[PDB]
Structure 1
Amino acid sequence: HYELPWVEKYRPVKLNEIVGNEDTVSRLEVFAREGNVPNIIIAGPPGTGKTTSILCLARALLGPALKDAMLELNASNDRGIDVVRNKIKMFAQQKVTLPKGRHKIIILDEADSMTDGAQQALRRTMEIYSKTTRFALACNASDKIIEPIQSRCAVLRYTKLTDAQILTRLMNVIEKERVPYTDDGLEAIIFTAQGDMRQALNNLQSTFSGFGFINSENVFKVCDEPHPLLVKEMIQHCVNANIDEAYKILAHLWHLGYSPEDIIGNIFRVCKTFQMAEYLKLEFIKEIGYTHMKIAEGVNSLLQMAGLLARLCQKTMAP
């Protein structure tokens, strides 16, 4: 036997072991205890627990009839226009004897990958057979799912996990695995997690396997500090036309091995949500796109990113 990693080994099997989004998870616990759950679409960031919540709800609702009363489909399946017509509808028509308040569950995990026509064909089989089957969809980008499907389901939105919510699960995993730690090392694991429980468990497993102790140095020897918090300081320096500190941050990101495309993507993602003037934000975004066209053409050097920083500093002092 081969031992699973801590992401897959410590996947929750009950809905009360899922941390974060306490009201939605509590209502899912009530629905799993009682029954008669509506059609559900869970959207949110990766690693929040959407697949875990859907699978735990389906398991707690169905019990021993999970093998014959559940149809699970992924992006690794076909699920095209011919599968929604022929397989999903035939499962929705299928007779399955269940206790009261329990229905068949068609889990459609990662529903962004489904095409528009398959989602159009899904509508009437959602609406007709709703007294015998239910739907539980998980997604990341909720705009990929069309508005009839979002009207036919309860749209639950998961938010990014906070520090204490991940810290509780990390304390549970640490007490399970007898991992020695400091508070600074757990804070570094939270810092590298960025609201992701998968990355928190992966970084904890990597640090414990590589060094056997969780302090800040052992975490930062194998894991990495996040990119946009450091990019935001450079954008703040470019707002005040401080080219020296902005180039210091740019050269530090350059010597870490980051490509110009990743750096300019982080610069654009920071400048989308930065707190400055809107016209200055549009000037910054237009200059970033002008530089990114040159990056995509083939000229991608440190001088080109320095010229982008110099043009962003010029945009400040040009009313």
Structure 2
Amino acid sequence: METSALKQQEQPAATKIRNLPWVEKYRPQTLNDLISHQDILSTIQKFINEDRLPHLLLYGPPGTGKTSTILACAKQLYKDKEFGSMVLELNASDDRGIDIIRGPILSFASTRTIFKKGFKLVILDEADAMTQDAQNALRRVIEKFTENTRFCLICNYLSKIIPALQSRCTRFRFGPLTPELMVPRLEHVVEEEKVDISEDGMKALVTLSSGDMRRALNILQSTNMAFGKVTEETVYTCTGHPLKSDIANILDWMLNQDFTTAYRNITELKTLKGLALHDILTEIHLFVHRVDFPSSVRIHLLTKMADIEYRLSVGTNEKIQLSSLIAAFQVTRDLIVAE
């Protein structure tokens, strides 16, 4: 049971004299404050305000603003004098099997309201963690009580939900933000917090977070307290990501000199920077499409690199896979250059 006093204590929890909760400093309160997914919140208002709210399936990458959004809709639809009596918010953190479906949800969905007459709502967080038969019971509960209560399933991956549960609900994908619109918010927080960031550090922040607001705040805040100024080298060293200069030098070694010297240099750089072969493969793949190669050379490199990345997954010798990565470039681009 329980697992609710921690969040209630956590909401007004800060040292307030030394700590700087940058992520919790700027939070939307209603649907008119979260300036993102304007189509989604507009059609959610259009569904609620005309008394035709359907079963909702909110999914997407985490940190996109799903739980706070549906909290805003639940608070704007139901007043605080009737909120707890007819809104039931559960999740898969409290799991003792599948009893929660035939217990709290089945009891809540099958009874009328207590104080103020209306329709009730069930919030279900991380619904992808449920088992298949738990979803098979949930879809029956939704099917036979669709008039009385509506359901809102908040999941991370849509592929873990059975097709019938997806069939009962309309789906809303919370995609990553166009990196451009994120910038105004970053200029806002740097103007508020009086920090020194160049445009290259801005580019680093928008390419590391991949459209996530919280991770951007975390990285910016951490680099600010670590150094006091943020450029690409400073954020990438604090993050421990493959630097663009390091990947460019790795590519230069694999394109220019022979097998043995490049292999020794890459091994030295990997032990020096704590670099894995997986992240090297990711950054080199990103470098492949920004470097002017012939189409056959690009096809060969992509096929070989995908094969190496598959081979790394099963737990092979990383040294031999590094040699194969060097070999993939030595087969084509070195003799193309030497011609």
How high is the TM-score relative to the length of structure 2? 0.72
Letter in 2 for 1:194: S
Whether the 8 Å CA contact 2:62–2:156 is kept in 1: the answer is yes
Any idea what SS the aligned residue of 1:208 has?
A: helix
Partner residue in 1 for 2:318: 300
Offset of 1:149 from its aligned partner?
0.7
| 1:285 has 2:302 as partner | no
Offset of 1:254 from its aligned partner?
5.3
Offset of 1:155 from its aligned partner?
1.0
Partner residue in 2 for 1:198: 214
Partner residue in 2 for 1:135: 151
Any idea what SS the aligned residue of 2:127 has?
A: coil
Whether the 8 Å CA contact 1:284–1:312 is kept in 2: the answer is no
Letter in 2 for 1:39: H
Partner residue in 2 for 1:90: 107
Q: Distance in 1 between matches of 2:246 and 2:143?
A: 47
Partner residue in 1 for 2:62: 46
Partner residue in 2 for 1:258: 275
Q: Distance in 2 between matches of 1:244 and 1:35?
A: 70
Any idea what SS the aligned residue of 1:200 has?
A: helix
Q: Distance in 1 between matches of 2:142 and 2:88?
A: 14
Q: Distance in 2 between matches of 1:269 and 1:155?
A: 33
Q: Distance in 1 between matches of 2:247 and 2:44?
A: 38
How high is the TM-score relative to the length of structure 1? 0.76
| 1:2 has 2:17 as partner | no
Q: Distance in 2 between matches of 1:235 and 1:125?
A: 57
Q: Distance in 2 between matches of 1:216 and 1:312?
A: 28
Instruction: Could you tell me which runs of 5 or more consecutive residues in structure 1 were left unpaired when the two chains were aligned.
Output: none
Letter in 2 for 1:105: L
Whether the 8 Å CA contact 2:56–2:153 is kept in 1: the answer is yes
Any idea what SS the aligned residue of 1:63 has?
A: coil
Offset of 1:67 from its aligned partner?
2.0
Letter in 1 for 2:141: T
Whether the 8 Å CA contact 2:92–2:129 is kept in 1: the answer is yes
| 1:77 has 2:98 as partner | no
Question: Which of 136, 161, 173 in structure 2 is aligned with 1:120?
Answer: 136
Whether the 8 Å CA contact 2:98–2:134 is kept in 1: the answer is yes
Letter in 2 for 1:149: L
Q: Deviations over 1:219-239 (max 9, x none)?
A: 445335578x8999799999x
Partner residue in 1 for 2:28: 12
**Is the alpha carbon distance of 1:308 and 1:207 closer, same or farther for their aligned partners in structure 2, counting shifts above 3 Å?**
closer
Letter in 2 for 1:10: Y
Whether the 8 Å CA contact 2:87–2:121 is kept in 1: the answer is yes
Whether the 8 Å CA contact 2:58–2:66 is kept in 1: the answer is yes
Any idea what SS the aligned residue of 1:165 has?
A: helix
Offset of 1:211 from its aligned partner?
4.3
Partner residue in 2 for 1:106: 122
Offset of 1:283 from its aligned partner?
5.5
Offset of 1:201 from its aligned partner?
1.2
Offset of 1:172 from its aligned partner?
4.6
Whether the 8 Å CA contact 2:195–2:229 is kept in 1: the answer is yes
Matches within 5 A, 1:221-236: 221-225=237-241
Q: Distance in 2 between matches of 1:173 and 1:214?
A: 14
Offset of 1:46 from its aligned partner?
2.2
Whether the 8 Å CA contact 2:223–2:234 is kept in 1: the answer is yes
RMSD: 4.1
**Is the alpha carbon distance of 1:269 and 1:187 closer, same or farther for their aligned partners in structure 2, counting shifts above 3 Å?**
closer
Q: Percent identity?
A: 36
Any idea what SS the aligned residue of 1:122 has?
A: helix
Q: Distance in 2 between matches of 1:74 and 1:210?
A: 36
Whether the 8 Å CA contact 1:73–1:108 is kept in 2: the answer is yes
Whether the 8 Å CA contact 2:54–2:150 is kept in 1: the answer is yes
Matches within 5 A, 1:23-34: 23-34=39-50
Q: Distance in 1 between matches of 2:74 and 2:50?
A: 13
Offset of 1:117 from its aligned partner?
0.7
Question: Which of 72, 82, 85 in structure 2 is aligned with 1:68?
Answer: 85
Q: Distance in 1 between matches of 2:153 and 2:267?
A: 41
Partner residue in 2 for 1:179: 194
**Is the alpha carbon distance of 1:270 and 1:173 closer, same or farther for their aligned partners in structure 2, counting shifts above 3 Å?**
closer
Count residues in correspondence.
Answer: 307
Offset of 1:43 from its aligned partner?
1.8
Any idea what SS the aligned residue of 1:255 has?
A: helix
Q: Which moved more, 1:148-157 or 1:57-66?
A: 57-66
Q: Which moved more, 1:218-227 or 1:153-162?
A: 218-227
